Amino acid sequence: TGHPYYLRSFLVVLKTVLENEDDMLLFDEQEKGIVTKFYQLSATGQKLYVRLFQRKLSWIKMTKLEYEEIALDLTPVIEELTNAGFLQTESELQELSEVLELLSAPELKSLAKTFHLVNPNGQKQQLVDAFLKLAKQRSVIGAVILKRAKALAGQSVRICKGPRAVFSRILLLFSLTDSMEDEDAACGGQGQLSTVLLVNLGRMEFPSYTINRKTHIFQDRDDLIRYAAATHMLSDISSAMANGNWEEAKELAQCAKRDWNRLKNHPSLRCHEDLPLFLRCFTVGWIYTRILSRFVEILQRLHMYEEAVRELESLLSQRIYCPDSRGRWWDRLALNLHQHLKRLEPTIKCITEGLADPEVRTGHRLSLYQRAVRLRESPSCKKFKHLFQQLPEMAVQDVKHVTITGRLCKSVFVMVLCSVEELALAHYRRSGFDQGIHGEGSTFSTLYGLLLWDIIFMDGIPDVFRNACQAFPLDLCTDSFFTSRRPALEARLQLIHDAPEESLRAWVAATWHEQEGRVASLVSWDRFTSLQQAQDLVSCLGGPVLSGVCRHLAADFRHCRGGLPDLVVWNSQSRHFKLVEVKGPNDRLSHKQMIWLAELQKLGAEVEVCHVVAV
Incomplete structure (x- = not known):
């Protein structure tokens, strides 16, 4: 069927x-x-x-x-x-070399034995090459090796x-x-x-x-071909990096960079710049920038730091492509110029202009700020006035920290062994939070999707629904998502802020009941064990918190999706809750999480960092 x-x-x-x-x-x-x-x-x-x-x-x-x-x-x-x-x-x-590769290790040895000439034992490469030499010098024993090897391969x-x-x-x-x-x-x-x-x-x-x-x-048939070509060229560099073939990667990317420098200025490559950001990502230019972005990642791995720095700057000097990435590009540039190249003047230029970029958001924003306070307080720097420099005092407030430790034997502990997140849940259960969701981002994301479904899938914004199997509007990850839906958003967003727990329960039920299973990139349908639980939770979180979280998610999903609290615990009877950022024995709080916790606290939610330590 x-x-x-x-x-x-x-x-x-x-x-x-x-x-x-x-x-x-x-x-x-x-x-x-x-x-x-x-x-x-x-x-x-x-x-x-x-x-x-x-x-x-x-x-x-x-x-x-x-x-x-x-x-x-x-x-x-x-x-x-x-x-x-x-x-x-x-x-x-017809290529003998192909047919040789096609044979198994039992089959190679069959061809190796029934050609007494070859020494029977050895690795696949050792036999294949012997066979290849033997056929080059003597073509009229060569076509005999082929005729048999083909038959043997079937x-x-x-x-x-x-x-x-x-x-x-x-x-x-x-x-x-x-x-x-x-x-x-x-x-x-x-x-x-x-x-x-x-x-x-x-x-x-x-x-x-x-x-x-x-x-x-x-534009025409050939644009798509250049696009496709580029995408593949990217894929291979990704692939090379995955396997630690960094030298291989470097060649492929060097190769690509040349293909790109050749390519700009063309009839087509203006156009694409003037596409809305949410379509501009499907352009040859965008892809190359992504390649060049990887190129820096590589040069960095290969301890070729002056190359990385020259690249980063050249990437940043442009604004058209991958703005969503400049926070990283800046951050990473500051890291190099400081840690590796040890060059003060340019380290500060970098941190300064990077903060002057409205494009760097959330975590990298917070990162660059910190790198600036450390630099201003720094004695090795103090011969100047270079960072007292009117910096909007964006505090990295240490929020309530907690540490835990369990009879250690994948890191498993004794309470009977149990996980790192079981330990963390366990801790809260005995601090009077019976409920908990070991989500990590999606808890919140799906709530937002649940509360703004119709606004997300809204009619009226052209070019965001281009065909049949979309789980999101194409503009969802761009500053434009919010702007193109401003009236409608502000409306619902305020509504949710002033909603009594029952209206939240209602609106969540509303969507759940109308959509339960439709593929929407924000919503994980089984993330809550049932609508009831989802309702219990919104009831604890309450309008203002949900409103706030939703707004950030709608206004900057790109730079806000990450960092949300790992674990969400709450009390069934008292409706008290706590948004926790769980930290396993060998990882730290990301800047993004620091930000998110601070934000949530500003919104009036109980938040907490949880460290789990080795036994």
Whole structure:
């Protein structure tokens, strides 16, 4: 009745992207055919394709194939895909070096033994190279090694890189909707989805809203190609970093930076700058900036600090791209110039101008401030007047701290062993808070989503709902979310501030009852054990607190989503509650959390830091 792991979901990606006019002006006549071709295979054919499309781009064996859930005999199926131009079979596998890599370790030794010439034992690389030398010098023993190694490897397929790229692009276009822009996504793999959203796309029921694009994100067919190209170039650098191939990373990024310097000034790359920030992230320029941002992360890892500093500054000197990141760029720059390069004058310039940037928010803001008080009080600095410098006294108030310690044996303790967060909950349960939610951000986030649902999904803001499978308006993570909905927000926000506990209980029930399960990026439906609990909690928190938290979340979700209190405990009978920031044995309070706790206290909530120490 539906289609497999990969396929029902793939079919959504296809359906969604095809019904999008602007998206379909980005594919030539030929390419669109490749879609109609796909739609015209057997389900079995579609299923096998999806399965393989998701795999690495290389030769894959028929023995290493065995998709029995697809068919008991895959050869009529593979046949169908080859005839359709989607797949290629081994009668086009001619590179001996490829065929050698394709064999197993039992199979290599079979080719190694039945070629007495080769010394039978060794690692895969040791045998492959021996075979490769032997065929270069003597081509007419070479084609004999191929003829046997091919037979021994059996039937084999590889994806036609032609149509692959069409779907890859279709799938990249699908990432604008949904996937990416709750701050820009992983991008890693150069072919497939991220794990979060293949498996579950077909099950998912989305919140209702009115689609209404009016701007063209991509100019002509080639823009999208430059975009795609860039995205992949990013993915690889991400990938290289993940595996600690920093030198590899450095090359890829150096490579990219050159590709970018070549690329600006072009006919297209003005335009994109003048896109609203919430669409500007889907631009070649944005991607490169992200790459360059990673480039600094790399150079830093490779102790190449003057390079990082030159980069950071050049990134900051521009305003168009990734403003949401300057807080980091500044912070990180100050860190370098101080810790590593040990250069005072520029360390202060940095901290000064960084604070003069309205763009640096919350935690990095607070960070730079602290780096400034430490610098002003500093004796090694005192030969001057350089930071008494009219600094709005943004206190880092130490809030109530608490420490705990349990009979230590993953760090497990004795109370019977128990976790670090079990210890923390336990502590509060015996301080008279029977209830508790070990959320970490989402508790609050979902409450806000619950209380502002209709405002979030609101009609009227153009270009924020561009197609079918969106869990948020595209502008949610941008200063513009608030501004574009100002009247409506201020309204509800005040309403909530002056609401009696029953109205809160009501409005939360209202949404819950109308939406329970629709995919909305802010709301975790199972985060509360039931509406009742969610209601109990809003009743403790009360209007003003909920109002405040909501406002920050709406006004600056980008720089406020993080840092919210880890754990929320409360008393069932007395309605007293406490917002706690749990700290395991080997981590500290982030600046973001310091900020959030302070903010919450300003709002009149009981807050607390909790340290758990080793036994």
